[PDB]
Each structure stands twice: as C-alpha cells, then as structure tokens.
Write an enzyme that holds these catalytic residues in place. Sequence first.
Site, PDB file in Angstrom:
ATOM      1  N   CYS A 155     -22.860  18.318   0.069  1.00  0.00           N
ATOM      2  CA  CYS A 155     -24.027  17.860  -0.614  1.00  0.00           C
ATOM      3  C   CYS A 155     -24.497  16.401  -0.834  1.00  0.00           C
ATOM      4  O   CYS A 155     -23.532  15.792  -1.130  1.00  0.00           O
ATOM      5  CB  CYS A 155     -24.192  18.796  -1.954  1.00  0.00           C
ATOM      6  SG  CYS A 155     -24.055  20.624  -1.167  1.00  0.00           S
ATOM      7  N   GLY A 164     -18.230  19.617  -0.823  1.00  0.00           N
ATOM      8  CA  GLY A 164     -18.377  18.269  -1.060  1.00  0.00           C
ATOM      9  C   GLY A 164     -19.322  17.681  -0.320  1.00  0.00           C
ATOM     10  O   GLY A 164     -19.750  16.281  -0.708  1.00  0.00           O
ATOM     11  N   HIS A 208     -28.203  20.348  -8.375  1.00  0.00           N
ATOM     12  CA  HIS A 208     -27.301  21.204  -8.597  1.00  0.00           C
ATOM     13  C   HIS A 208     -26.316  20.531  -9.018  1.00  0.00           C
ATOM     14  O   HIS A 208     -25.142  21.165  -9.634  1.00  0.00           O
ATOM     15  CB  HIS A 208     -26.985  22.455  -7.620  1.00  0.00           C
ATOM     16  CG  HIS A 208     -26.535  21.677  -6.534  1.00  0.00           C
ATOM     17  ND1 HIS A 208     -25.056  21.514  -6.175  1.00  0.00           N
ATOM     18  CD2 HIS A 208     -27.153  21.704  -5.029  1.00  0.00           C
ATOM     19  CE1 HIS A 208     -24.899  21.199  -4.738  1.00  0.00           C
ATOM     20  NE2 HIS A 208     -25.773  21.438  -4.099  1.00  0.00           N
TER      21      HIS A 208
END
Lengths: 303, 303
Positions: free
Chosen positions: B145, B143, B41
Amino acid sequence: SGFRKMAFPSGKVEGCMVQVTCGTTTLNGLWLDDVVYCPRHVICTSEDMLNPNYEDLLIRKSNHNFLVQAGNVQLRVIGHSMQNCVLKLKVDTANPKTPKYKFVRIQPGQTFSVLACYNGSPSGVYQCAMRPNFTIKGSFLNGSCGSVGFNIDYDCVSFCYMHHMELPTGVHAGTDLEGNFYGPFVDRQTAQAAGTDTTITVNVLAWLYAAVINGDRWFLNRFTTTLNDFNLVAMKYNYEPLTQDHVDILGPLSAQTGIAVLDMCASLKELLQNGMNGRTILGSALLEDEFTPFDVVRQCSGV
Amino acid sequence: SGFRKMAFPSGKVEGCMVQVTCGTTTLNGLWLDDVVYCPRHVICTSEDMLNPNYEDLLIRKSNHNFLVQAGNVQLRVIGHSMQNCVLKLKVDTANPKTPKYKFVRIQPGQTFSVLACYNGSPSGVYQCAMRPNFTIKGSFLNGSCGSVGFNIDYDCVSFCYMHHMELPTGVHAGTDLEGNFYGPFVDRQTAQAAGTDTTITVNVLAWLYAAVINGDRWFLNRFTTTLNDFNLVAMKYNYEPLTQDHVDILGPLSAQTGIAVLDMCASLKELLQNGMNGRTILGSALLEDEFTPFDVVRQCSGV
Ligand SMILES: *C(=O)[C@H](C[C@@H]1CCNC1=O)NC(=O)[C@H](CC#C)NC(=O)/C=C/c1ccccc1
Ligand SMILES: *C(=O)[C@H](C[C@@H]1CCNC1=O)NC(=O)[C@H](CC#C)NC(=O)/C=C/c1ccccc1
C-alpha cells in the site's frame, strides 16, 4: 496476490544512458565510470553494411568523430577502442550516477529487463526472456540500438544485453556487454535467421505454480508421472527436456504449494495433450514460458 | 517492430518513494516537495478495521506518531492532515528529487504504470489498465500500500493511482492522489465486491491495429460493418459500445494501416463469433484490451 510480467525499476540504468553520434548515425550508449559502451555498427555507412571491415572503419576514425551527449552536456571522447561487437569510448568525465554493476552473460531460459531508449532518452521498460535459440522477443524501433537489458540484485545492476538488430521474423538479437553476440548472428547484412525455438519447460512449470499460488487450480489432478514419461511427451510438443536439477530448482515452489514437481508435470502433460478447452490460467489462454522459478518466488513471496 | 506491455521508466518516481510507519504498520509514502502522501489506513489497528472512524484515530495522533524514512535518513514530521482516504504528512525537508508532476484522475479504459514498492523500496514496474468496473489487475502483496501508478508526458509525472487494497476476486482497488477512491470501494472491512466488468472495445481495436503494423494479418477480411450492427454484436459478448469518438481516436492507426475502422470492426465481429481456431495475435490466444490507441502509436511509431 496477482501475477504480472514485472520489470526491475529502471532508475539506476536511466542515469547511465547517453546518446552517441558518428557520421549521420545516432544510437544509444551506456556510460559507466569514464567509459561509454555502444554498438560498433555506429561507425558504419550505408555503402559498407553487407560486410563492413570494422577494423578498417575504426582505424580511419579519430576521437573527434564521436559525439557523446548526456542529456545535453557534451562529453569529450579521449580514447576509443573496439571490443568484439562493442565500442568503448573513453570520455573525460566519470558518470557520477554510476551504480554498482557487473557484466554477466545469461543463459537461454533466463529473464531480464530491457530499458528501451531512443537518442539517449529512456522510452519504456519491459521484461524479456533469452529464447533457447538466443533471440529475444522485444519491442525495438530504428534508433533503439545500444539499449540494454539487465537484472538487479540488491543494488548491483548486472547488465546482460545490448541491442544490435532485428531479424526478418521480427525477433531481436544482440550481445552481452563484452560485445559477444548471443547466438549465431553478426552485425552486418545477411539473410540471417534464428535456429528453431523450443518452449522453456521449467519456466512453464514455475508459472503453473504461480497460478496455484494465485488460486487457479482447475488444471491439477492426482496423476503423477515419471520424469522419463514426461520428457517423452515434452519432446513431442517441442518442449525442452526436464532435468533433475530443474526439479530441484522447483523445490521451494513445490513445498509452498504442496504439489510435487512430478505431479505438476502430470498436469502439464494433460494440458499439452488436451489444451485448455476454453479456460485460462493467470489470464492467459497459452502456456507461458517467460517466467523463471526466481521470477515467481520474487513476485509470489508469501502468496 | 515487436509489441510488448511497456511501462514508463520508473526513475523519476523511485526518487519519491519513502517508508511510513505508524504503530506496528509500515507502508509506502510518496514524497513530493515537503509533503508525504500515504494511505490513511496506516493509522488503523487490528481492533478497528471493520469500520474505523478515521477522524477519531487522527485526532488522537501527533506528529511524533509518524516515522518517515527516505532510504534511511529520518524525515521529521511537522504537520499532518487527512484528505479523503490519503494522509498528508508535512515534513521538514523538500524532496530534492521532486519531478515536475500533476495529480490527475484517469478514466476507465486508460492505462498507467505501477511502481510496486515494499518498505519504501521499489520492487518492480508494470503496466495496468483501469477496468470499466474501477478495479485494476495488478500484483500487490502485504506491505505494498502506498505504491503509486503514473504516466509520464515529456518529463512531467502525472500520478493517477495510490494502492489501498485487494478484493476477494484477487483484483486491486485504490484512490487517486487526492484520496478519492476509484469505484464503490472503502478503506475498511467489508465483503466488498466489484461490479461486473466489460471488455474495452476501443483498446481491442487498437491492439488489432498494432498486430497489423507488426505483420499479423490473418484476421482481416473485405467485410465492413455498420457501427450499429457492430455494437449489436459487442453487446452480446460483453464489450463496451463503440462510439464515433472512438472511431475518430482510431483515425491515425486507420490511416497508417489503410484499414478503415469499420473494416477492422468486421474482423473483430468475426473473431468474437468464431474465435481464433488455434491461431494467435501478437503472441496471444485472447483478445487483449489493456492497450490504448496512444499506447499503440507510442510503441509502433513508424512500424
Ligand atoms: C539499431 O538501432 C537497429 C535496431 C533495429 C531497427 C529496426 N528494429 C531494430 O531492432 N539496428 C539495425 O538496424 C541493424 C544495423 C546493422 C548491422 N540492422 C538490422 O537490424 C537488420 C535487419 C534486417 C532485417 C531483414 C533483412 C535484413 C536486415
Ligand atoms: C496494503 O499494503 C494492503 C495491500 C493488500 C494486502 C494484500 N494484497 C493487497 O493489495 N492493503 C490492505 O491489506 C487493506 C487494509 C485495509 C482497510 N485491506 C485489504 O486489502 C482487504 C482485503 C480483503 C479481502 C477479502 C476479504 C476482506 C478483506
């Protein structure tokens, strides 16, 4: 979101851990530049543990009595000296992995990360608080002495703890990195026992703020209290007095949640007098006091 | 002695963390040999988040759309591909710090360490369990991920988790390192909700054994129970059934403490039916289920 007991990443400290053997005793050492620091009781033997004279034991030692291994590269000891309850073993190589570092002594109520080690090899990492009675509630087995506790600020490691012993209650005691014990303990053999502990009030309040930031609100109320009337209740439940400086330190959390410190004190008073009645806060059924205001802000930045 | 939620030392994983930017989205990547793994993503934009077609977004991308930074050395992307919910960005340099590693998928009830990172820089380390409903109760902000979860066995890192998202309940969801989600979640925008969770019975029993090993004995009794009569009670309190294999896995702890598994089950039944009545176990007023039998043996070896 979420809130966990979080340690600092341990890599910079892992690169400093060595194994130190003297006699049949092996423990952990901390290798920074060309010095290895370790607990002085590595030079003790079973027959001199109730009250060793460490100055005698050390004068009777030579450099070649100390075997220092990094991984399994042998480091040659070229000098030795005692600094309080720590030995400083000068070695012939500067540790190439030496981080920027400081030796800092912490205050009761402050937290730090512990890198538990055995035979110079890191085993695990976890967060501890220095209790008001100068003990820590850690996880240490035989062979763990010389394991260190630390904080990281930017890329500078502030070492604050070296592990020396376990008390009869199962809690742990150690020194700062200048070898000065935290609390009234000695590295010998006594029936030694910690003073009576108290709860770190400012940390409980900080943790209530973390809970609010994470959507736990059931314990709030409109009540407010005076600092005096709160400290009356705190004293009854073995909590440390709350000072105006603690209120100031709690400022940013107060502003982030819009709950005044003394309003949150009113919630804590109710929690002390009534308990939780079967509910939980951040997954705990007890009031948690091992998170500082800084720990909360660091983990809860921007919700 | 002592018992703490202990993470693995994080150094070997810290050396693998990089920062990956595509568009205005920056997150974390995992750099092993000459591949960087990150959540797919990272290629999404605000206007295609409810249901992005990731195959379209990716065909419309080139290597130069991906900025990969290790510390602040820029790594040139020379190839890109999608593997399920993870991107594999081929880069022109093999990571010199690549540890021995495996990509393993874990089971509900197993634990692992999480190295929380932001902008490629490690922030902290903590222990999580994979819940029976395939969520984890972590601590993750915007932030985070691309942060990974892992176990270490000897010096081989078994990566098992990469972080992708937070659910409305505040719990977290992610994939294994082949990009296959744990549980029925998707990396898009849904009202997505976890299935109903249960308590990991074998882990609670393991943690009771840790408590005994650490001198907490008040919850024991002479009662024993049958596996059937225990599982009747477990079902009532939303605990997972206990199997003979769980009893076998608990063998060594049984032998170390001299308390038969089914005797310890009798203690757990009493704890479920009566609660603790104001007492604690290993510092908790709740029954803890995020320690595996292995976690206990590893930490409690030889008392
Ligand atoms: C060093 O590795 C070791 C660490 C403890 C071993 C058991 N758990 C520990 O944290 N340090 C020691 O064993 C020191 C050595 C000295 C001096 N001694 C003790 O920890 C004494 C413990 C004790 C308990 C109860 C009665 C007497 C002594
Ligand atoms: C990646 O860094 C980020 C991590 C979460 C941010 C906030 N806490 C996290 O763990 N991942 C995301 O933001 C993903 C992106 C996608 C797809 N989305 C979500 O986490 C959605 C959360 C949500 C909650 C409630 C309703 C809708 C969506």
